[PDB]
Structures are given as C-alpha cells and as structure tokens.
Amino acid sequence: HLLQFNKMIKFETRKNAIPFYAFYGCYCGWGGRGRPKDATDRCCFVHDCCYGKLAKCNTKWDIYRYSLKSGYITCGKGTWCEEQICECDRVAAECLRRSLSTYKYGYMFYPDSRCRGPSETC
Amino acid sequence: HLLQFNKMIKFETRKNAIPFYAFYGCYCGWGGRGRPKDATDRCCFVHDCCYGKLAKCNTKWDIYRYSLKSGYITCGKGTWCEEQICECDRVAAECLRRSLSTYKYGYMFYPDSRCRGPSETC
Amino acid sequence: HLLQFNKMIKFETRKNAIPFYAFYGCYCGWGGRGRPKDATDRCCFVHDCCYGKLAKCNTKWDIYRYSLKSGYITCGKGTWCEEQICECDRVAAECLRRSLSTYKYGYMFYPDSRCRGPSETC
Amino acid sequence: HLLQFNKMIKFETRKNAIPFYAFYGCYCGWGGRGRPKDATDRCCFVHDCCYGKLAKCNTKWDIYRYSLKSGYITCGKGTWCEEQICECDRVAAECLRRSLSTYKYGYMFYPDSRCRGPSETC
Ligand SMILES: [Cl-]
Ligand SMILES: [Cl-]
Ligand SMILES: [Cl-]
Ligand SMILES: [Cl-]
Ligand SMILES: [Cl-]
Ligand code: NA
Ligand code: NA
Ligand code: NA
Ligand code: NA
Ligand code: NA
Ligand code: NA
Ligand code: NA
Ligand code: NA
C-alpha cells in the first residue's frame, strides 16, 4: 500500500515523501517520462518499472506484511502480489537512502517541461 | 486497517470476509443492533465493543504491523493505537475460526429487519 | 497542488481523500482505465481528462490561490496554469459532493482486474 | 510553503526568488551566519528569526491561504501555524521590494567565506 511505501521512505531517508520525493526529477512520485536526472531519480524510475510489471496486482492499496524488527526492512511471506509489491517498495526506499549524498534540492519540484526527451526503457 | 483485518479473517477461517462475514447475523460487518444470533455473531459484537473502547484511534484505517510467521497471527510493535487495533482484529479473527463449528450459511446475508431484539450492552 | 485538491475533496465531500477516493472505482486517484463505474468514478474520469489538457502545467505541485471565505471554493486570479489546475480541482471536488448520494463503500478499493473493458475517450 | 513565499517575492520584487534571492548575501535562502550585508540581506535575517519563533510549525512546507485580490498580499484565515508562517513570508516579500534600491548583483551568489565574524542575535 502506498502509505507503507511512504513509511519505508521515511524510515530509510529520514525525509517525508511529501515534499522530498513526490515531485523529484522526472520519475519520483506518480507517473514520469524522459530520462532519470540522477541516482535519486533512477531509484524512482526503477520503482515505476517494478510496479509496471505487476499489472495483475493492486500496487497502490494491497496491504503487505513487512517488519523493521532487525533494524532494516524485511518483507513478510504472503501472496505473490504482496511479496512483489513489498520487494519493489523495499528496494526503492533502500536505493533512496544510498542516493542521499547526491540528492539536489534544485530537483525537488522538477518541471515536466524539462523531461521531454526520449523515455528510458524499463 | 480493515483490509488487514479481512486478511486475518481469511487466514483464520479459510473464508473471504466478503461475502462470508461482512453481512453475517446481526453484528458482522459495519454497525449492528439487537442480540448476537450465535457464536460467529458474538465474535463480531465483541469486536464492535473492542473498537468502541478505542474512540481516540483511527480503528478502520490505521495500518498496523502483524505477522503470520509460524502459523498464527502476532501483533507487532507500534503506536498504542496500532497495537490496540491489531489486538481487537487478531482476537476477532481467532474467535471466528473457533466459531466455525456453528457457522450457518443461512445467516450469511442476514436481514437487519430481523435484528429487533433489545440491543446487547458491551 | 495535490494537497490543495485533497483539502477541496474533504471540504466538499466531508470525507478524507485517503481512503475514500484514492482507490475508488476505475478512475479515482492516479491513473485509470476502462469505463467509469458510477457518478463518483465519472468525476475522477473528467478530472483526469481536465489534467490531460494541461500537459504544459505542473498539475501535481503548482500551488494556486483559492478561498473558502464565501462558504464555497473560489479560485483566485493568477497564471493561466494556476487558474486551470484550480478549476479542474474545484469542479472535481464539487462533482464528488453531488455524487455522494450514490457513493458505494464496495467501490472503495476497486481492483484493476474489474476495469479491463475498453477505455472511455475524453 | 516555500513555493508560495517565492510567488510573494516575485509579486513584490518582479524578480524570481531563484536565482535572485535564494543565495543572496549572508542570510538569503536556507541558513545564514555573520552579519547581514545590506537592507535585502536584513529582510532575510528577520525572516529566519521569524521562522525561528515557529519551531512547532512546518515553516517550509505548510500550505497556507493568501490573497493578491486587493493588489497587496493578505494572509487568509487558517490554523495558528498557517497564519504565522504566512505573516513571516508576507513581511519578508514586502521588505525585499522596499530594499530594491540597494539590491547588488554582486551579492547574488555570495560566498559563505565572506560571512565570517559574529552572527547577529535575533
Ligand atoms: Cl509539498
Ligand atoms: Cl505488517
Ligand atoms: Cl499468490
Ligand atoms: Cl487506506
Ligand atoms: Cl491560497
Ligand atoms: Na517532477
Ligand atoms: Na513515477
Ligand atoms: Na459490526
Ligand atoms: Na446481517
Ligand atoms: Na481503482
Ligand atoms: Na485517475
Ligand atoms: Na536564511
Ligand atoms: Na550566499
């Protein structure tokens, strides 16, 4: 569920998804086009591709099981859809933490007009 | 969250909450009046009472942590509200499983017009 | 900005966008496909079409000016993009209020698998 | 919200906050140290102090209500935090317009190395 993904983002980065990742670059948040601008944007591009491969799953609201017990995100065992959505979310939240050193406040509210180039393939 | 409670019900009873428990007897699903018709209905009555003690909590939509590891439901650590809601849901799903011996398909879509007895006190 | 649209939804419908409208039917929330299921879903379909005509605007994060002073939502004068985004948001929030009489809790977390029909043209 | 403050700055000064005010002198934009270099820089120093009194508020990202209808910025009614943040932003944007006669393009991208010395008290 998207609120669980936002919790993973906050757990990993210490930043709230709104405003820090919801409008970042060309791919962070809903939708996206063109070329990923940097490492942070590329995490979001991969996440969008990950969800795209799950067309038979309810990626936005299926509530999966996960744990923080070990001091990192672990996806619980469940339905194929729950495990796959959780895995997309976990990978993206960890990727965003790894990309923190190159996060640019200048890309925070990035205009769609700067994302008009050919769209990268998943 | 209601969708997590529905997953607990499926896990414990082996029946989907919709249609098997969402309209059952006088108390299963949202609301309720009169007297619980049987053991299954009484689980739902107790669940309504459990939520009734949590007026300061977002009982229907707060997403809590839980696990199915080792074949039973375990509520994870979180806010006081998450833990309390999870406990209501876990107890009700286990109660519904224990009430399977008297589950009646005839009570599945029970008309609220037949729930005319005095309403039971929590 | 999406947070302003969510405030308009709450003001008009008296329901929070999450969970009541974010996953409703085939078109409410981000994206959509197939045929709108009812009046509420049709508001969301029209909103998607409205935003679709605003490709040169930053529909998700451009913060427009609006007022609730008169007891109704009134869009402030501003840039062409601010006025157009505000107008999409205001019309949709009012449409959702007018559709309240047929709002179905059963359409709340609607699966994409039930939206597989031919997609309606804007 | 910072994007609303940037719209107020544009309305008052006729300059976009990025690049004209976001890196100006010792205090304009995020952070600041030393002594304000000029009237423009002093506006930004006072704005930082204003936000400093609002530690319980989300100064950068809370979306408040404001109007330009009268030909002047007027803060609308809202939560205590929204009203207080809007007041800080309104005062600063007006101050920047009043400081225009001494705006120096030479202070636009001012180096932190020249903001050595004792930091002024709020
Ligand atoms: Cl924001
Ligand atoms: Cl969980
Ligand atoms: Cl499965
Ligand atoms: Cl929800
Ligand atoms: Cl406003
Ligand atoms: Na963007
Ligand atoms: Na995206
Ligand atoms: Na009930
Ligand atoms: Na019933
Ligand atoms: Na849907
Ligand atoms: Na939509
Ligand atoms: Na500053
Ligand atoms: Na500077």
Residue numbers in the entry:
A (entry chain A), B (entry chain B), C (entry chain E), D (entry chain C): 1 to 122
Give the exact sentences the study uses for this entry:
Crotoxin from the venom of the South American rattlesnake Crotalus durissus terrificus, is a potent β-neurotoxin with phospholipase A2 (PLA2) activity. Crotoxin acts primarily at the presynaptic level and induces complete failure of neuromuscular transmission by interacting with specific neuronal targets. Classification of crotoxin complexes was made according to their stability, toxicity, and enzymatic activity, which depend solely on the isoform of the CB subunit in the complex.
The crystal structure of CBd was determined at 1.8 Å resolution. The asymmetric unit of the crystal contains six individual CBd molecules. As expected, the structure of CBd is very similar to the other natural CB isoforms (CBa2, CBb, and CBc) and to other group IIA sPLA2 (EC 3.1.1.4). Two sodium ions were observed per CBd molecule in the crystal structure presented here. All six CBd molecules in the asymmetric unit contain PEG 400 (present in the crystallization solution) in the interfacial binding region near the canonical calcium-binding site. Analysis of the protein interfaces in the crystal structure of CBd using the PDBePISA web-based interactive tool revealed two probable tetrameric quaternary assemblies of isoform CBd. The tetrameric assembly of CBd can be considered as a central dimer (A,E or D,D) associated with two peripheral monomers (B,C or F,F), respectively. Interestingly, the central dimer interface overlaps with the sPLA2 interfacial-binding surface and the CA-binding interface of CBb in the CA2CBb crotoxin complex.
